[model samples]
Target: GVQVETISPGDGRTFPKRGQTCVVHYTGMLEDGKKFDSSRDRNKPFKFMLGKQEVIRGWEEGVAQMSVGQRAKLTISPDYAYGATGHPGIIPPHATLVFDVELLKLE
Candidate 1:
């Protein structure tokens, strides 16, 4: 399951389409507010092809609903994320993750 909460309206138009390339900046945190990952920490944005299954299902679904320059908080359940296995060292099994994400560009 995924919950989408808008943080910013972005440019107000232009949602990403499948096959388009998208870039985002994000910080992933555990339910307890522990840091797990952050793209902005390295000053690099994360990029992926839309509908390519290159990321968690929650991200794929949530990002598709975003416009360029949009910012949102994505609350991801285990099913849409790592499921029962999680990310091993970084993510606990069955954890519900939270991410502060920003859509930087679409190409």
Candidate 2:
């Protein structure tokens, strides 16, 4: 089990286990605070298990740092986010990313 916290009250909590799958809505932006993606904008959330490499390293770590109904503003460094091989049409190489995430539910 691991503990997590957020910058705002009622916005984050800890995960009780390593392999829990979480459902979340999020907004991602570049360092200049330009939003690039948003689940809310799409009317859908994203889901993945903790530690899963399906997402960037920062996403894996940042999402793990939340509990249900939690919201957070994550400023992820380039290393923790997309590295040199950025995903096409999504992440840029060696770019830092910002995420405003809401931990909607975990199952």
Candidate 3:
């Protein structure tokens, strides 16, 4: 299960759709609050085509609901995230993930 808490409701009626580009800033962390990655720290917004599986499943689903300039926190269960295998050296197996995400642009 994934819980979404909107920090900011962005303007416009447009939402991300499959095969469209989505640019966002995000911070990924474990349930214990250990940070794994942050697009903000890198001073770059991450970009990916929606529904292409370029990122994790949670991300695809979470971002899809966002409007441009929206900010939200996603509490993602492992099943919607890395799952049992996880990402090597970054996420532990069966770990839950938390993401603070802001939708920046769509194309």
Candidate 4:
């Protein structure tokens, strides 16, 4: 199961729904405290259709738990992530990952 820790609350009461879109900025870190990926580093937010399985399972679930302007720390398990086939040269096999994700916008 994924552990979702709220860093901050949402802007309004509006939560992202199915078939909607959510834009987020995230920093993905490994268990060793190494930063593997970040939207901040890219200077652009990532957008995905809600509940469409466009991203990892942990991320999909985490985003659904958030609202516009919400910030959360997601502790993702191997089962919720890439499992044994981790990202080459970036993530390890069956690594438990962590992410600092913020919902920038939702529509």
Using TM-score, give the best candidate's number.
1
Q: Which stretches of candidate 2 lie over 4 Å from their true place?
A: 1-7, 11-16, 88-90
* Model 1: pairs clashing at backbone N, Cα or C within 3 Å: none
Model 2 lDDT tens row, 1-107? 11233655443345525677878888888877888988989999888887667777777777776667777788787788767787777777878788888887778
Cα error of candidate 1 at position 78, Å: 0.6
Better of 2 and 3 by TM-score: 3
- Per-residue C-alpha lDDT of model 3 across residues 71-102, encoded as one tens digit per residue: 99999999999899988899989999999999
lDDT score for residue 4 of model 1: 88
Question: Which runs in model 4 stand beyond 4 Å of their true positions?
Answer: none
Q: How far is candidate 1 from the true structure (C-alpha RMSD, Å)?
A: 0.9
lDDT of 4 at 46: 88
In candidate 2, which residue pairs clash?
11-70, 11-71, 13-67
Ranking by TM-score: 1, 3, 4, 2
Worst 10 residues of 2 by lDDT: 1-10
* Tens digits of per-residue lDDT for model 1, 1-43: 8898999889878899999998999999988998889999989
**Of candidates 4 and 3, the better by lDDT:** 3
> Which one wins by TM-score: 1 or 4?
1
Q: Give the TM-score of candidate 4.
A: 0.92
Reference-based TM-score of each model: 0.95, 0.80, 0.93, 0.92
lDDT of the candidates, in the order given: 0.92, 0.73, 0.90, 0.88
Residue 81 of model 4 has an lDDT of: 90
